[PDB]
Design a protein around this ligand. Structure first.
Ligand SMILES: CCCC(=O)NCc1cccs1
Lengths: 300, 237
């Protein structure tokens, strides 16, 4: 179990760690989060009490270094940093634990939610989508745009998701126009899975990361990417059976975890109705279709 | 964006453009089977691709053999239309290729967009107008060449005959749309109007009769009357 200490909490802020969150008051004695499960990526995220504009945060994996949070009063945000002095870090943590100034990552033992939401998400792939190679952790916020969004403006601050465009030469083989547009299997299996992602695990990883950025930061381009990757699978007549079964589990837990009051903006009616009721895979997503129908029947 | 009443003069400027109408591509007769079920029999169709500035009509005849062994023909017809329009564009010299293609039905947008990916600078546009191009098969010489075809065939026609020697494109298109609207609303009456006077003939190289300017005004007035009339007979006004 690992720890992310905080130097201090000088401004009132709502702090999230994965799917949990808690309020910290201005200058409240708060020195971090302990008992973070090892083996998963994690995200620590922030919404200031005075400017609910800009949710922002950091993706990290405690196996890759010792990370802490420190508020920067010049740039006005909580920043993640790496502590390279291992003994200095252990000492800092042990003292803050002894003073009981840390919140405990509050995982119920029965609960697999975070595993299920991050099953295929790896830090190494996150760091290719979010390029800042001098850090082991990755910053994301509400306003960052995707490479594809920029095509339709600061490249260093972009989300380099894999561009998916259904009316593009990459998606449509010359002479198979109708075939490839109505059945996207060649774009899914040959172009994307075999060519770009190499395997379904990396495809699901990016799909899951896109959802999480949409949910935790309200990142609109991430929501677009999540829905595009769903629609590319559902619009393919030929998908490996294991991918369909896994997709159903992935989306089930995403829909289960989505705040009910955010569905209106985070769920695209056209994609979901097409995927669950019109597409080739309309009958292959039983768990996802059942939770959607019981939780968001208005959308459909 | 979309083509409508407000931007109607754009049709007659100097940027090359084509209308594409797919109404008459997939044509069937519906009939009973010996067992008392219903079946369709396809008949020859055509793509109606028209330059509204010059009157140049590229009439691609769609022979019933293209449907043999195919499923979901109404969907296929849109993609076949888009394939043939794309092939036509590729066949034209660069300086004759259109800058825009306006489809008369919105369902042609995605099929044509996908077939034209190689031409990113050609705009594919819908229209809000209710254009009467389905009535093209009420033009006897066009109907005749479609029905007689025994194989796929492209046939070239100027749909304005020689009118542009005496009138502008705007006026020519207005005349064309009035004639076709009349033919669509009441084909028999419309055709009676056009041929009532045996002394006015259709030149071998034309589609419509050789009316004088004064006779066109009379004709155009009779076609307007017809279209309001049928609008009374239909709505009881
Ligand atoms: C084909 C009858 C003679 C003529 O008017 N050619 C010009 C055209 C080019 C394309 C359609 S019409």
């Amino acid at each position: 179990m690992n720890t992310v200490p905080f130097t201090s909490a000088p401004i009132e802020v709502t702090i999230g760690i994965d799917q949990y969150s808690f309020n910290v008051k201005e200058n409240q004695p708060f020195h971090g989060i302990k008992d973070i499960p090892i083996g998963h990526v994690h995200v620590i995220h922030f919404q200031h009490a005075d400017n609910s504009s800009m949710r922002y945060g950091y993706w990290f994996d405690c196996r890759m270094g010792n990370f802490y949070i420190q508020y920067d009063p010049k740039d006005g945000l909580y920043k993640m940093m790496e502590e390279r002095d291992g003994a200095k870090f252990e000492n800092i943590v042990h003292n803050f634990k002894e003073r009981q100034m840390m919140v405990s990552y509050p995982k119920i033992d029965e609960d697999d939610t975070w595993y299920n939401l991050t099953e295929f998400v790896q830090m190494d792939k996150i760091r290719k989508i979010v390029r800042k190679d001098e850090n082991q952790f990755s910053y994301v916020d509400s306003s960052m745009t995707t490479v594809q969004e920029n095509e339709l403006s600061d490249p260093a601050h972009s989300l380099n998701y894999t561009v998916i465009n259904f009316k593009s030469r990459e998606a449509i083989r010359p002479g198979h126009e109708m075939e490839d547009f109505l059945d996207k299997s060649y774009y899914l299996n040959t172009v994307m899975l075999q060519g770009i992602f190499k395997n379904s695990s990396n495809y699901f990883g990016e799909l899951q990361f896109a959802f999480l950025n949409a949910m935790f930061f309200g990142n609109y381009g991430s929501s677009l990417q999540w829905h595009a990757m769903i629609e590319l699978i559902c619009s393919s007549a030929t998908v490996p059976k294991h991918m369909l079964d896994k997709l159903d589990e992935i989306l089930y837990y995403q829909i289960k975890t989505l705040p009910e009051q955010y569905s209106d903006i985070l769920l695209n009616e056209r994609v979901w109705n097409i995927c669950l009721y019109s597409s080739f895979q309309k009958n292959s997503l039983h768990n996802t279709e059942k939770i959607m129908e019981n939780k968001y029947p208005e959308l459909l | 964006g979309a083509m409508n009443s407000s931007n109607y003069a754009e049709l007659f400027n100097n940027d090359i453009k084509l209308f594409v109408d797919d109404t008459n591509v997939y044509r069937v007769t519906v009939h009973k089977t010996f067992e008392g079920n219903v079946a369709t029999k396809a008949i020859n169709g055509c793509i109606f691709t028209l330059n509204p500035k010059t009157g140049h009509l590229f009439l691609k005849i769609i022979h019933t053999s293209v449907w043999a062994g195919q499923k979901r023909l109404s969907q296929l017809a849109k993609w076949k239309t888009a394939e043939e329009v794309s092939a036509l564009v590729r066949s034209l010299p660069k300086e004759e290729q259109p800058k825009q293609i306006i489809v008369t039905r919105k369902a042609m947008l995605d099929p044509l967009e996908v077939h034209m990916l190689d031409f990113p600078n050609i705009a594919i546009r819908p229209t809000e107008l209710r254009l009467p191009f389905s009535a093209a098969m009420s033009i006897d010489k066009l109907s005749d060449v479609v029905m007689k075809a025994t194989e796929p065939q492209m046939v070239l026609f100027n749909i304005y005959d020689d009118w542009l020697d005496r009138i502008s494109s705007y006026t020519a298109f207005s005349r064309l749309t009035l004639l076709l609207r009349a033919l669509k609303t009441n084909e028999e009456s419309a055709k009676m109007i056009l041929l009532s006077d045996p002394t006015i003939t259709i030149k071998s190289y034309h589609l419509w009769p050789s009316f004088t300017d004064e006779q066109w005004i009379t004709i155009e007035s009779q076609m307007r009357d017809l279209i309001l009339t049928e609008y009374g007979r239909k709505y009881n006004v």
